[PDB]
Amino acid sequence: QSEQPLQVARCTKIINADSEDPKYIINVKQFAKFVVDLSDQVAPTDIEEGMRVGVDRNKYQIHIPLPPKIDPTVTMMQVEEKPDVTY
Amino acid sequence: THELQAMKDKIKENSEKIKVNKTLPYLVSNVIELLDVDPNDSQRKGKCAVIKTSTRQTYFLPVIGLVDAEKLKPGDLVGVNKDSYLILETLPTEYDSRVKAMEVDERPTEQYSDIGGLDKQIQELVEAIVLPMNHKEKFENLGIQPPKGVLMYGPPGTGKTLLARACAAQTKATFLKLAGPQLVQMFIGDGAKLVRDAFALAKEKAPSIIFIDELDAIGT
Amino acid sequence: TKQYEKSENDLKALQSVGQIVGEVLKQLTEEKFIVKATNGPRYVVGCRRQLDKSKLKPGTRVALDMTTLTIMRYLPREVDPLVYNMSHEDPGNVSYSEIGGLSEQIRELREVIELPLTNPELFQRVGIIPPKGCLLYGPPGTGKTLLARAVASQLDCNFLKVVSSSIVDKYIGESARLIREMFNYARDHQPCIIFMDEIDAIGGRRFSEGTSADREIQRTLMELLNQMDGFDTLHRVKMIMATNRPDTLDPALLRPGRLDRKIHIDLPNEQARLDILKIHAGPITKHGEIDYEAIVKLSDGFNGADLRNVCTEAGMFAIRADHDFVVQEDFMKAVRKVADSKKLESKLDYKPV
Amino acid sequence: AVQKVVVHPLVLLSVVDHFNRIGKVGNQKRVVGVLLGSWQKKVLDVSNSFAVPFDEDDKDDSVWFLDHDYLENMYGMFKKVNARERIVGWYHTGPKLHKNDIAINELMKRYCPNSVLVIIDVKPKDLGLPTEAYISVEEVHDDGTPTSKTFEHVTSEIGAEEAEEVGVEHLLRDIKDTTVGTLSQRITNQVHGLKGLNSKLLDIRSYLEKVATGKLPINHQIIYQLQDVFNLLPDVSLQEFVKAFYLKTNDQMVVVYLASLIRSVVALHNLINNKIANRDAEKKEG
Ligand SMILES: Nc1ncnc2c1ncn2[C@@H]1O[C@H](COP(=O)(O)OP(=O)(O)OP(=O)(O)O)[C@@H](O)[C@H]1O
Numbered sequence: 001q002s003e004q005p006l007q008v009a010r011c012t013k014i015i016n017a018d019s020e021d022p023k024y025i026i027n028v029k030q031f032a033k034f035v036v037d038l039s040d041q042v043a044p045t046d047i048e049e050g051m052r053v054g055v056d057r058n059k060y061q062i063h064i065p066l067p068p069k070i071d072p073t074v075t076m077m078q079v080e081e082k083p084d085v086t087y
Numbered sequence: 088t089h090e091l092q093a094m095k096d097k098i099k100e101n102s103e104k105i106k107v108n109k110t111l112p113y114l115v116s117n118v119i120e121l122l123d124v125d126p127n128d129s130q131r132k133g134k135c136a137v138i139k140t141s142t143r144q145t146y147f148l149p150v151i152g153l154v155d156a157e158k159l160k161p162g163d164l165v166g167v168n169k170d171s172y173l174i175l176e177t178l179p180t181e182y183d184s185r186v187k188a189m190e191v192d193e194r195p196t197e198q199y200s201d202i203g204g205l206d207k208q209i210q211e212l213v214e215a216i217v218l219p220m221n222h223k224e225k226f227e228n229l230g231i232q233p234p235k236g237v238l239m240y241g242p243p244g245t246g247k248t249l250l251a252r253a254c255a256a257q258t259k260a261t262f263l264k265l266a267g268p269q270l271v272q273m274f275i276g277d278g279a280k281l282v283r284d285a286f287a288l289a290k291e292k293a294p295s296i297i298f299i300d301e302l303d304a305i306g307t
Numbered sequence: 308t309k310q311y312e313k314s315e316n317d318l319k320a321l322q323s324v325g326q327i328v329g330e331v332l333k334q335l336t337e338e339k340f341i342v343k344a345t346n347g348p349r350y351v352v353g354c355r356r357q358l359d360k361s362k363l364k365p366g367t368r369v370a371l372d373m374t375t376l377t378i379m380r381y382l383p384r385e386v387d388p389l390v391y392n393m394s395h396e397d398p399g400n401v402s403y404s405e406i407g408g409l410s411e412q413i414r415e416l417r418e419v420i421e422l423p424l425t426n427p428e429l430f431q432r433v434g435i436i437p438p439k440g441c442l443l444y445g446p447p448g449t450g451k452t453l454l455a456r457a458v459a460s461q462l463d464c465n466f467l468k469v470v471s472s473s474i475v476d477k478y479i480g481e482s483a484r485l486i487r488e489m490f491n492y493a494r495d496h497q498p499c500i501i502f503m504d505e506i507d508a509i510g511g512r513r514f515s516e517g518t519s520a521d522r523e524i525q526r527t528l529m530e531l532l533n534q535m536d537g538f539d540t541l542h543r544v545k546m547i548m549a550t551n552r553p554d555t556l557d558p559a560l561l562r563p564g565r566l567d568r569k570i571h572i573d574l575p576n577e578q579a580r581l582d583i584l585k586i587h588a589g590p591i592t593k594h595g596e597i598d599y600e601a602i603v604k605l606s607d608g609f610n611g612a613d614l615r616n617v618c619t620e621a622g623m624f625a626i627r628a629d630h631d632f633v634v635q636e637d638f639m640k641a642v643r644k645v646a647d648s649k650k651l652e653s654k655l656d657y658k659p660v
Numbered sequence: 661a662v663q664k665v666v667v668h669p670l671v672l673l674s675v676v677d678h679f680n681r682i683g684k685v686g687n688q689k690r691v692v693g694v695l696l697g698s699w700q701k702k703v704l705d706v707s708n709s710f711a712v713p714f715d716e717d718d719k720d721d722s723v724w725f726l727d728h729d730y731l732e733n734m735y736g737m738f739k740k741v742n743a744r745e746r747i748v749g750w751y752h753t754g755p756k757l758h759k760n761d762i763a764i765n766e767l768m769k770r771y772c773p774n775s776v777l778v779i780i781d782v783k784p785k786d787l788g789l790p791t792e793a794y795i796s797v798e799e800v801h802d803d804g805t806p807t808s809k810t811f812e813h814v815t816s817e818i819g820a821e822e823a824e825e826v827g828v829e830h831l832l833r834d835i836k837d838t839t840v841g842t843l844s845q846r847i848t849n850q851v852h853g854l855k856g857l858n859s860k861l862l863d864i865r866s867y868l869e870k871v872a873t874g875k876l877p878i879n880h881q882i883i884y885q886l887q888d889v890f891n892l893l894p895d896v897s898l899q900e901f902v903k904a905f906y907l908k909t910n911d912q913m914v915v916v917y918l919a920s921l922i923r924s925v926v927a928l929h930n931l932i933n934n935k936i937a938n939r940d941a942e943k944k945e946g
């Protein structure tokens with residue numbers, strides 16, 4: 001029941017520039033760039049250049065922003081957690 | 088003579104039929120302008136421009152419809168709706184993400200007054216940046232060409248980067264932060280295409296300013 | 308008045324979906340044709356009744372229908388980037404011969420490049436072939452680019468400019484066909500001229516075998532040589548390459564053929580310093596009674612823009628003196644100081660032969 | 661202009677189904693509607709159309725009315741769904757044309773430069789490929805009449821389209837297709853003499869009737885002109901084939917030779933292989 005919404009979020013897409021407020025150019029990993037407006041559920045001021053946002057594959061409109069742009073692998077050896085070796 | 092207002096209603100009513108076709112300019116299509124006539128085999132004449140799609144497919148559609156051929160030389164970024172392949176409007180500006188704007192800097196918290204004892208060699212600095220702006224009117228009279236590049240070098244700390252940006256605070260110059268090694272990525276042809284975008288904005292925009300660092304290493 | 312409704316009827320034609328382009332290969336029969344879309348799939352499909360005999364072709368780009376995949380009308384090509392290479396311009400004629408040196412090098416590409424168009428009969432009657440390539444390196448002085456650059460647009464309005472940034476392309480770079488595309492549209496201009504600048508980057512040497520990035524460099528070189536090895540316009544087109552040092556060419560490009568002529572730059576002489584001076588005067592003017600020999604003599608072995616900087620640097624000292632002109636005593640000050648500062652940065656002028 | 665027309669079974673049915681519309685309510689005249697043509701070239705094609713209420717009085721033989729509120733807005737309907745489809749003319753089921761038909765075309769010439777009328781037939785009878793087509797021109801006349809507007813016959817031919825044979829050609833299901841090469845060509849031959857020589861007798865009796873009555877048509881001259889083109893060979897007594905006699909059998913030369921050569925080896929393929937496979941199963945079983 002909740003799988004029907006957000007099912008169209010494929011795929012993660014980066015925007016490029018803005019000529020006007022309603023319409024922005026966006027590029028997706030499919031290699032296809034998409035100009036589109038954003039849904040009334042998200043304010044236009046929250047869209048900044050280089051922001052990966054959701055999409056509706058039917059309407060191509062912006063759905064929800066996704067904070068992480070990055071990064072493939074390289075994190076697991078970078079991230080360190082839990083303590084040891086006190087003073 | 089009053090029939091102009093009568094037809095003005097049906098063109099706005101049919102422009103509303105364009106509105107539902109203008110929502111939304113669903114995808115980007117690279118534009119290539121072309122003019123050709125095909126004899127048949129009665130006669131069919133018209134202007135038709137071959138269009139691209141960023142999906143790597145290429146299509147064929149008549150000249151838009153709406154915005155005419157007056158703009159522009161073959162472009163990109165224009166919006167087009169799903170599989171109908173009609174472009175409603177030609178949309179700027181260029182691309183892409185951080186390539187368009189490397190860094191957005193308003194103004195530094197410090198000013199050129201923060202350097203002691205360097206007043207002799209700051210004048211050479213301050214001149215080359217300031218003189219093309221306010222003194223440009225005097226250059227066309229005397230035939231003076233303003234300097235472009237300036238090499239600022241010294242053993243660190245020399246306070247070079249603080250002094251550079253601080254001179255852009257009082258001159259209202261918009262600052263753009265850039266580094267030499269930032270132009271190297273896994274994918275070949277990135278930082279190289281950036282100058283094509285960067286200097287295109289140098290033609291579009293007025294200085295302002297652009298500052299880079301570590302030119303000696305990258306120039307090896 | 309009614310022209311608006313005409314555009315409204317044009318929107319009814321905009322309702323038609325665009326067809327898909329493709330490249331034909333060959334034909335099995337008249338009823339079976341083999342076409343291949345730019346995406347790479349091949350389709351054996353039927354054809355409609357409105358086409359003509361010119362559709363068949365030996366593998367010419369065509370458009371395929373969205374359902375039967377039949378060919379409607381063939382579009383020759385499409386190119387986005389071409390216009391940015393159309394706009395390159397350089398003066399001279401005179402401004403090329405005004406560079407002051409080297410004198411015989413101005414007499415080189417004059418008859419080598421510009422002459423084939425105006426008088427092609429001179430070469431074919433005697434039987435001597437014009438050179439198909441040239442190489443200009445540096446910087447013992449300046450003029451590596453300008454020497455070939457001014458004669459580039461002096462042949463005609465024809466030119467095609469190539470920047471080294473377009474060869475690297477991207478991951479799994481498809482510019483292999485763009486090097487073919489860029490040279491394809493270079494042949495749209497006749498007679499064609501080809502530039503290559505800063506090849507010390509994209510000219511990657513195979514001496515010490517590195518990452519496969521050095522291999523795809525050679526593949527881009529293959530796209531250069533292939534079309535220029537034709538089977539197509541060859542003696543008519545003039546290719547030019549430039550490098551910082553010619554150790555990057557490898558034994559292939561070091562050889563003539565591909566890179567034919569090698570030319571360096573020398574320094575001017577005395578009483579010729581007054582010649583190159585007159586063309587550097589230009590916009591900047593000074594006091595009525597003067598002798599420019601003090602100016603240029605203090606700066607020796609300098610770029611034409613460096614001497615042009617010395618003239619502006621001496622002219623930017625005028626605004627500090629709140630005068631239009633300056634006496635030559637303060638000139639030589641600003642001339643000598645800045646010039647001696649450039650000589651300490653003149654290291655690494657030694658270049659391999 | 662308009663040379664030949666292509667009438668689909670779909671648009672022709674649009675005249676036939678309207679014969680059920682006003683046929684149950686009656687009363688006089690026929691089915692009449694406005695024709696939507698598809699013109700890609702000099703050859704004319706018709707895809708769809710729309711039938712309009714129409715009546716023609718007898719008395720009052722010159723009275724006719726189309727409904728043009730039906731013609732205007734419904735055009736914007738079919739135009740919105742199909743941009744290529746436009747009105748090329750009108751139609752009706754005839755069977756023949758009264759003199760009043762001159763005024764139907766001239767009124768709608770504001771819609772199309774030349775409106776082609778299509779006479780159709782709801783009940784197939786005779787003599788062949790059905791219906792009919794006319795074009796509106798002015799030939800005046802040789803006798804000096806005031807400018808005469810008379811519809812000239814346009815050759816009509818049926819044609820097909822993709823996706824339209826789904827339901828159409830399904831419902832018959834009783835036809836044998838074809839078979840090309842054996843029965844297909846020979847049944848035509850028996851009919852080529854029938855349909856060829858019946859119009860021969862029908863016209864030669866009306867051409868004899870000319871001298872008797874019905875003159876004009878004089879014609880003139882088209883009648884005897886192409887009849888004399890038929891006269892390259894008459895063929896009359898006897899066949900005048902003295903030059904074509906040895907050539908007669910000489911065309912049958914190789915046709916009989918191959919038929920003699922093929923049946924010899926086809927037998928060698930049929931006779932041998934049958935005997936082989938037969939005795940292999942027959943005698944080895946028992
Ligand atoms: N000659 C100087 N005049 C003024 N400030 C100085 C000087 N030398 C050092 N400083 C101070 O030292 C600090 C360190 O700056 P530093 O000179 O290391 O930057 P930088 O080396 O120029 O940066 P980069 O290496 O990116 O060019 C600065 O905050 C600056 O205020």
Ligand SMILES: Nc1ncnc2c1ncn2[C@@H]1O[C@H](COP(=O)(O)OP(=O)(O)OP(=O)(O)O)[C@@H](O)[C@H]1O
Pocket residue numbers: 405406407408445446448449450451452453454583586587610611612613
């Ligand atoms: N002889 C000259 N006369 C006028 N201007 C000159 C001359 N030589 C150089 N210049 C100026 O210097 C600039 C650079 O010229 P050029 O391309 O010859 O040098 P370069 O190739 O940039 O230097 P390098 O060879 O070190 O790369 C040009 O914009 C030109 O205006």
